[PDB]
């Protein structure tokens, strides 16, 4: 029977086949599926046992990558598929089916043989690149190897999967680009074929073989010709991140779309690519039903800007990088021609045009001078071209005449303190406490190198039907707070003596620009920024701080015209976030006065089987996608439901993206262009990172909940929760408030979170996470891999099991359960090496004396006190060291003062600092 069946399978195609089945029996294998039926839902990995698969052999007896699959099904589905295939035969993007009947024992059993398929469907590729696990990724190695994307031994490299270690993996993935583009074209052809043939059915990923030929016609209901409805919400949306991970549209940069032919020479003066964007959308995403506005200026709400921007972040990787950035124009001001920005061409939000352009102006008040002197049009138009080959980021101009190299000093040394420590049995050979935090020095070109670190920021397209729901859930985490636009006289700025970016740092600190402008003008500038875009020149400074690793952290000092208005826009909400206790975003909650025990016991909010986990993002601000930061700025700007209109909010978003996301960075006397990612010097950085972190965690939860099989969820509440979550993602276009609240309650009851910028501590239920009904460490590694483009190693992830010890590390402060006042409380202690390093190595040279810097060792001992009850003794003596050294400093100060000028200091207030009672009072809940 084997040869009779195999011979029939190898029909008129005239092919030679090797059978993978045993005796013409069904084959069972693991395969991804985008399944949504009456029973289960979710893009998970199932067993597939309905088909018998043979593999073709080319000449010379070698297995070519082509398979003859043979589905076996009842007569009803066979007859319903025969008609729908004969009605779709003429389409070229459809695998050549072959229908027949076979006798096994005493009855016919129809067979639908799909011919010339490939081993891995598109769903397998999407799942492998979307749910990535280091330990077992064998559907990605096979896909890469079998399609000439790399060598079989390319996977012997140390870290072949790490976007940060070896950026060559990007090229290996991009070698899949043409196949994905051909899949897009073939699915557009198939949608057209079924529209012209009047077939209505759902398009699933797991039916398109990697070549592109669709091969399943089961649930294709038929209607009159010309009235087909191909449902492509769960296909074009699950295929989004893979569409820029593999740079599917790179081949659109070449003339006539051919890869071989040279790049299409776009005329440099072109900035309005609206026609090209619309043409690309109608060529690839033809049947994506929702409207696409290439310029987001004419969108409808916060949920349409995300959609349009998510499409633009892919349609702008075809157009030249020298056409984005500000649009300049010659405005005459009393007969002198300026070159001022009169718009912007964002990579995501399309073309934005200012509404207040006044050629032939007469007077320039302080506000107008502030706006013009900040725009990079004058600076980068009057500067001389510059081709900096030390980096990959674009380069605009060189304001100065010659580059400036900034070094980093090596950090002074505190000889007396180190001698005292060594005398008191410290820094011995092989001790539990050792010097590990040093002041590292850097060569001339450190600043440019740490700016070049932006090469990790790639254009990332985010699954939109999942992001538009994760945004709602993330918003529920911010519903407690209140905020809005505040007038200029309600603004609170901590210190006004901190520099004001560029070029405003050439004439004064921020105090000059905050006191030289009246409140009416300071508010007129804000109302102006609410009606047009003002580009700004950020300046990247170096940080001179003690650290355990020798990367020279750079901080993006933003211009005054940007911070001074982001404050009016965001201060109310930021203070509301910093003044709310018991919320997910623990900002403003001190670790002193029992403020850390409160944090921990708020985290442990009735989660049945707690198992703490925590993750630190590697390069949180230099790898955060543009889309996630745009969404974060939208979530913080949704409190303005009354103060600002829709266009006002959009222009505020455009200003934030012009001044933070993709700006002109003046990294040491030259204007480069940031690819993206947040500038960690703007008003909303520690709060715009919190939103991004919560978005990543919630997306991990969504993926972990969906990717479960569905029949193996014993709990019948969670099965229905999954079945409704999938249809709320991919089968609903409007917000489902009741279900958003239900899922937020589910997350709070099973995924309690404590988020602080990029430092998170989850207290997830252990049994559900084991069963996959909530996130986990792998379910977050995968999310980072396919959304942040950084593989998160196990060095930045921890998972505790005994709640008593508390989190392994949160904000660099370990936690310990200790006895205090008849009750056990969690005290945070630092790394002792950090405290000893802060003692021995000091920033300045005047601080080295110590005798006139006793108010520093008190503040170090305040942080080092908790160590005084650590079980280890070398850990706990790094506090008595500070107490005894403060006593020594006081004695020496008294002696020196007596010698130089005979005045015995008034004691009884300085004797608290070398007694533990004063420091122990700092960790009691009285205040």
């Amino acid at each position: 029977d084997a040869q009779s069946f195999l011979n029939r399978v190898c029909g008129v195609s005239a092919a030679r086949l090797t059978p993978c089945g045993t005796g013409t029996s069904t084959d069972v294998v693991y395969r991804a599926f985008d399944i949504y039926n009456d029973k289960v839902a979710g893009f998970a990995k199932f067993l597939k046992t309905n088909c018998c698969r043979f593999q073709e052999k080319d000449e010379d007896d070698n297995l070519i990558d082509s398979y003859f699959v043979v589905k076996r099904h009842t007569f009803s589905n066979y007859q319903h598929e025969e008609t729908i295939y004969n009605l779709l035969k003429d389409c070229p993007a459809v695998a050549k089916h072959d229908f027949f009947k076979f006798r096994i024992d005493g009855d016919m059993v129809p067979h639908i043989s799909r011919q010339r398929l490939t081993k891995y469907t598109m769903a397998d590729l999407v799942y492998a690149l979307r749910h990535f696990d280091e330990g077992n990724c064998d559907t990605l190695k096979e896909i890469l190897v079998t399609y000439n994307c790399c060598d079989d031994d390319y996977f012997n490299k140390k870290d072949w999967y790490d976007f940060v270690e070896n950026p060559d993996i990007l090229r290996v993935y991009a070698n899949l680009g043409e196949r994905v583009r051909q899949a897009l074209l073939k699915t557009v052809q198939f949608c057209d074929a079924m529209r012209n043939a009047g077939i209505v059915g759902v398009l699933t990923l797991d039916n398109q073989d990697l070549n592109g030929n669709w091969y399943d016609f089961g649930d294709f209901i038929q209607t009159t010709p010309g009235s087909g409805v191909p449902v492509v919400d769960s296909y074009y949306s699950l295929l989004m991140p893979i569409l820029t991970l593999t740079r599917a549209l790179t081949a659109e940069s070449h003339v006539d779309t051919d890869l071989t032919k040279p790049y299409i020479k776009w005329d440099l003066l072109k900035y309005d690519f609206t026609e090209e964007r619309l043409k690309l959308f109608d060529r690839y995403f033809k049947y994506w039903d929702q409207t696409y506005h290439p310029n987001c200026v004419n969108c409808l709400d916060d949920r349409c800007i995300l959609h349009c921007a998510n499409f633009n972040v892919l349609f702008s990787t075809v157009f030249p990088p020298t056409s984005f950035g500000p649009l300049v124009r010659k405005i005459f001001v009393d007969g002198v021609p300026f070159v001022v920005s009169t718009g912007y061409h964002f990579r995501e939000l399309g073309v934005v045009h200012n509404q207040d352009v006044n050629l032939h102006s007469s007077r320039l008040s302080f506000k107008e001078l502030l706006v013009y002197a900040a725009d990079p049009a004058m600076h980068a138009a009057s500067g001389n071209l510059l081709l900096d080959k030390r980096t990959t980021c674009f380069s605009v101009a060189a304001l100065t005449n010659n580059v400036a190299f900034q070094t980093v000093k090596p950090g002074n040394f505190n000889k007396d303190f180190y001698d005292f420590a060594v005398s008191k049995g410290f820094f011995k050979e092989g001790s539990s406490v050792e010097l590990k935090h040093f002041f590292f020095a850097q060569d001339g070109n450190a600043a440019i190198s740490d700016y070049d670190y932006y090469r990790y920021n790639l254009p990332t397209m985010c699954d939109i039907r999942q992001l538009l729901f994760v945004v709602e859930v993330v918003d529920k985490y911010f519903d407690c707070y209140d905020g809005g636009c505040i007038n200029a006289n309600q603004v609170i700025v901590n210190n006004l003596d901190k520099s004001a970016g560029f070029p405003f740092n050439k004439w004064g600190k921020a105090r000059l620009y905050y006191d030289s402008m009246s409140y009416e003008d300071q508010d007129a500038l804000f109302a102006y920024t609410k009606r047009n875009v003002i580009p700004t020149i950020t300046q990247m400074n170096l940080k001179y701080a003690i650290s355990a690793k020798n990367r020279a952290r750079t901080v993006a000092g933003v211009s005054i015209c940007s911070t001074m208005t982001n404050r009016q826009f965001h201060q109310k909400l930021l203070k509301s976030i910093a003044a709310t206790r018991g919320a997910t975003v623990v900002i403003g909650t001190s670790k002193f006065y029992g403020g850390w025990h409160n944090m921990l016991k708020t985290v442990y909010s009735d989660v049945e089987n707690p198992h703490l986990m925590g993750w630190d993002y590697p390069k949180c601000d230099r790898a955060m996608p543009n889309m996630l930061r745009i969404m974060a700025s939208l979530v913080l700007a949704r409190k303005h439901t009354t103060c600002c209109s829709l266009s006002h909010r959009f222009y505020r978003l455009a200003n934030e993206c012009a001044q933070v996301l993709s700006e002109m960075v003046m990294c040491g006397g030259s204007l480069y262009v940031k690819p993206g990612g947040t500038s960690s010097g703007d008003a909303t950085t520690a709060y715009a990172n919190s939103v991004f972190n919560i978005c990543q965690a919630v997306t991990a939860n969504v993926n972990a909940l969906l990717s479960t099989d569905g029949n193996k969820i014993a709990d019948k509440y969670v099965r229905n929760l999954q079945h409704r979550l999938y249809e709320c993602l991919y089968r609903n276009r409007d917000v489902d408030t009741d279900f958003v609240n239900e899922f937020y309650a589910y997350l709070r009851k099973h995924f309690s979170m404590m988020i602080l910028s990029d430092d998170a501590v989850v207290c997830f239920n252990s049994t559900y996470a084991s069963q996959g009904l909530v996130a986990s460490i792998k379910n977050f590694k995968s999310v980072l891999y396919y959304q942040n483009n950084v593989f998160m190693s196990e060095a930045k992830c921890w998972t505790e099991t005994d709640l008593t010890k508390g989190p392994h590390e949160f904000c660099s402060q370990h936690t310990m359960l200790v006895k205090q006042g008849d009750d056990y409380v969690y005290l945070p202690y630092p790394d002792p090496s950090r405290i000893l390093g802060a003692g021995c190595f000091v920033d300045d040279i005047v601080k080295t004396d110590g005798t006139l810097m006793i108010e520093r060792f008190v503040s170090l001992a305040i942080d080092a006190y908790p160590l005084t009850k650590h079980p280890n003794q070398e850990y706990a003596d790094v506090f008595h060291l500070y107490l005894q050294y403060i006593r020594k400093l006081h004695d020496e100060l008294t002696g020196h003062m007596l010698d130089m000028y005979s005045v015995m200091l008034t004691n009884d207030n300085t004797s608290r600092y070398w007694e533990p009672e004063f420091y122990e009072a700092m960790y009691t809940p009285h205040t």
Binding site: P410, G411, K428, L435, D443, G444
Partner: protein, 73 residues
């Protein structure tokens, strides 16, 4: 305690060099800072002392910048 006494001598030595205006030599400063960062990142002690020898040789290369005779006494 012979190990953690090199990670501090290297800091002081690079501070001394940075005061002799060795920053100007963009290659000598790169070599000095690389030796400094490698000494500070030195699990072993033989490597730390070899790199300290090299850095001190940088300091002694300068003819009259530092008066060895006045100090070693």
């Amino acid at each position: 305690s012979k190990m953690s006494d090199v990670k501090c001598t290297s800091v002081v030595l690079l501070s001394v060099l940075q005061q002799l205006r060795v920053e100007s030599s963009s290659k000598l400063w790169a070599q000095c800072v690389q030796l400094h960062n490698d000494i500070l990142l030195a699990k072993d002690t033989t490597e730390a002392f070899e790199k300290m020898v090299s850095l001190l040789s940088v300091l002694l290369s300068m003819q009259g910048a530092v008066d060895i005779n006045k100090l070693c006494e």
